[PDB]
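Hi D.,

Good news: the full-assembly prediction came through. Inputs first.
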Amino acid sequence: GRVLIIGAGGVGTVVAHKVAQNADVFTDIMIASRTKSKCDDIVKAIGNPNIKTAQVDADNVDELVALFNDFKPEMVINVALPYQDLTIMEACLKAEVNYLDTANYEPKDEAHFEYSWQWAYHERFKEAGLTAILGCGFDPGVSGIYTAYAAKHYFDEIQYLDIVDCNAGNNPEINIREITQNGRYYENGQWVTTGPLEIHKDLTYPNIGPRDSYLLYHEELESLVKNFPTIKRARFWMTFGQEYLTHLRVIQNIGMARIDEIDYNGQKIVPLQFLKAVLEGETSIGCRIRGLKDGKERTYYVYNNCSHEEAYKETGMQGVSYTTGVPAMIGAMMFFKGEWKRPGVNNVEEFNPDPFMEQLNKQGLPWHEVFDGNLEL
Amino acid sequence: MGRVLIIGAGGVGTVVAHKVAQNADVFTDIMIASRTKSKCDDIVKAIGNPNIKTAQVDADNVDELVALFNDFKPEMVINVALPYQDLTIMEACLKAEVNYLDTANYEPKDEAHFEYSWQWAYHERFKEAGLTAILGCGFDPGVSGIYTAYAAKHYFDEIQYLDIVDCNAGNHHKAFATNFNPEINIREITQNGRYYENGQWVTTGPLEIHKDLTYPNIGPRDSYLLYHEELESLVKNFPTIKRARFWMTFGQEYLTHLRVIQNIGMARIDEIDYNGQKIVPLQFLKAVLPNPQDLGENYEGETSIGCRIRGLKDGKERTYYVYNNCSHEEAYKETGMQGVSYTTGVPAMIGAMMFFKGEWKRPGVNNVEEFNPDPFMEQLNKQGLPWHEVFDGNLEL
Ligand SMILES: NC(=O)c1ccc[n+]([C@@H]2O[C@H](COP(=O)([O-])OP(=O)(O)OC[C@H]3O[C@@H](n4cnc5c(N)ncnc54)[C@H](OP(=O)(O)O)[C@@H]3O)[C@@H](O)[C@H]2O)c1
Ligand SMILES: NC(=O)c1ccc[n+]([C@@H]2O[C@H](COP(=O)([O-])OP(=O)(O)OC[C@H]3O[C@@H](n4cnc5c(N)ncnc54)[C@H](OP(=O)(O)O)[C@@H]3O)[C@@H](O)[C@H]2O)c1
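Then the structure:
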């Protein structure tokens, strides 16, 4: 049960905490990242001196292979940035290490992500007997596990999938890249494109109430549509307050959302990253699913609500880092326990959702089901 | 001597170079020196006069400036670099016995507070050396004080109320851009408002007080009260003034962008460590924002800047409104810049002309209202900034 965490950010902080909380499964833990001091901060916060740390540039396959051959992990949990997905997978192949991440690949010079890059590794991973688990955060991640759970127990055919993500509380480089692209959803065999944050409507969230929700593309639509060909329409919605949208608009207008490197006193700075250097309540994230069971239409809503305060008291991080870090740990737990072992490259919906859902209820993300309700869309 | 040296090759310096080159009878030898020499050479190529010399200089370095001054031997140095360079350039002018003019008074790099004490401190040294320093000779500061001196000289026994009003009614068709150096521009407009009334200076919140004011050829515009450096010297030099305020128009989209820039920390003036390098966020913002110097091509509309003055003549209250409207497109066609660079650059050239012609000769450190306004006002009509007068109208203020 040797696990290596790459990335000492908000998510990695949560993953480390949750891995440490399950030492019967995770007997040996290391945290490696670009800035080692953040790794050591996490170890001190957890209070477990047995967690090892290391500096590594995960853009460098050779550095990674040396680290992997030193610590000898059985799985690496990549919660660095999407840019590191492929170099880490390369190192995993060469050092015969299994793999898990929470976000699929996008190149540094283009804010477009898709699964082709990582799916390309399927046969190499398979012939090496290695398992890769892609997109095992909350969304992507629990959102596809929720959908697999519904398909397994409640639906003959899933026909409409609507993922809803509300942060009702009170990494910006990858975050602002995600939300500024054209919207995109799936309907009747085709991918449909909107303007950025053009389509929106009020959706009512448990314990929160109605919130302005905006349609945008999201990674998991690509694989969920592929893996559930009964789907007639799949969309993803996220809430955005007016002040947030205003700040987002201005940031773009002034040039601080740029993703190319600019030259500033002999140093290569990308405006969006420099912005990062300067930049109560709860989340509610789930899936609203409609389809057929025993010849009749049926609706289903399954969700988690995560309190920012409770997440902070446990891990020092807020609800967005918490909801992503917990499932990443559980994915590794499923592999270590043999519940999720499938040589090749896998999306979460391809595994048995039941043992994962059972752990979510025990590891800080209890989920709730509403049957036969009005899904509002 | 007739030799003039221009420091700063930005938007204002581009205009100043064009305007001095247009008056070769006065300015017989011209040099443009600036931190980045290629921009000096860009200006000379645009003007088409190979006789204009260029040079690289770091105007933060008194030694470098003195060497440049003793080589070129200017009679006056027109400082249109940043306020930060005001004192080092004045130091060098004193050491090399060269006269001085700028369009903005000093603020330290580490504090967004400007005032005249720094430069007034050089008065007796300049005076003893026979050197004249002309401070704040742009449009506002500059023409705004020359307008005031003009009104005091010709139309009032006693001026009592001064309101300077500044509207940029143009459209540069950018989501957001500033009209001059964004670093200096943003530092200025984000401070607390201040004005003068009944013997005291009153502080307001930033952009707290605003009125609808009607601008010639433009109409009503949302106008905001803020401090402006010429209020300090004009209140000093015209004691009869009872109330002095400065107003500038801001559109809603502009204010929205300005608010967000401050909230996200990109208006900060302190240095942060970014990959072992010291970076001032406001200075980084300048790098990505549109360059004011490149806006003229798609700039339409015009500016309107003037002074609304009220006071007594022969015991009766009178009003006076004097202003200039400047077409962004005409400024662009003439100089490649836009109306804010133009309104600032033309009066800087004229102040130097007044010195070269002997009209404005006053050893020491001077604000523009201390000179005879008449010959300056005459040149404004001839050098591209004609002004208009309205007598006894409603000042709305
Ligand atoms: N599926 C979901 O629900 C979900 C939700 C949110 C986020 N995520 C994903 O989670 C990941 C982490 O997010 P976060 O918020 O924790 O980000 P973060 O706070 O910026 O942390 C990223 C970490 O990766 C490190 N890193 C970056 N480049 C590296 C390199 N070349 N070599 C080694 N380490 C490197 C960073 O090092 P430094 O300390 O030097 O900066 C930092 O410690 C991202 O991929 C994000 O897309 C997924
Ligand atoms: N009175 C008024 O009505 C009024 C109105 C607007 C502006 N102004 C003033 O006019 C001045 C010029 O503004 P602008 O918009 O033209 O600014 P700008 O476009 O940024 O140009 C300033 C110039 O100074 C140069 N410079 C900066 N630091 C220097 C240093 N250490 N040594 C030498 N040169 C240096 C810059 O060089 P680089 O090319 O290397 O950047 C640039 O060429 C400012 O002081 C501003 O406050 C006055």
